[PDB]
């Protein structure tokens, strides 16, 4: 990895949601629901390392 950054649920400048979304994001991350959603879509058809 060249750098490190991350996605976002970006709201307008001065919105009453950039706090209500991150309490909801961290609630989905402590419960592990952001990993059941990533293993669902980034699953793939499988790929061999082979050695």
């Amino acid at each position: 990895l060249i750098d490190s950054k991350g996605y976002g649920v970006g709201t307008p400048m001065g919105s009453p949601y950039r706090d209500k979304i991150t309490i909801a994001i961290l609630q989905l991350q402590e419960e592990g629901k952001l990993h059941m959603m990533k293993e669902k879509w980034w699953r793939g058809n499988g790929c061999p390392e082979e050695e």
């Binding site: 996605y7 976002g8 649920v9 709201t11």
Partner: protein, 50 residues
Amino acid sequence: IDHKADLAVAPLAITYVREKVIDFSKPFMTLGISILYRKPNGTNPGVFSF
């Protein structure tokens, strides 16, 4: 910016030039920049490799 829609639920990365104009939330994935290069075609060792 001109308040036409509220959320941006899409892979919209958190950068320095974007944070000044819109409010991102805290991340839900984590990124990096990396090279997508193509794999070689193995070596294919033959059955008469001796």
